[PDB]
């Protein structure tokens, strides 16, 4: 059970990089970071 929050704009913006670790981008877009 998870959604992401954030728009897929920034969420891509943050794996692109690689700055899934932070939490900032992670709680909110769990489908993107957490990758569930």
Same mark, same amino acid.
């Given at each position: 059970? /998870? ?5 897929? &704009?920034? /969420? !891509?913006?943050?794996? %692109?990089?690689? @700055? /899934? %670790? %932070?939490?900032?981008?992670? !709680? @909110? ?5 957490? &990758? /569930?």
């Amino acid at each position: 059970a /998870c959604k992401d929050v954030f728009p897929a &704009a920034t /969420c !891509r913006h943050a794996k %692109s990089v690689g @700055n /899934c %670790s %932070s939490e900032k981008y992670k !709680r @909110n877009c769990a489908i993107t970071c957490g &990758a /569930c």
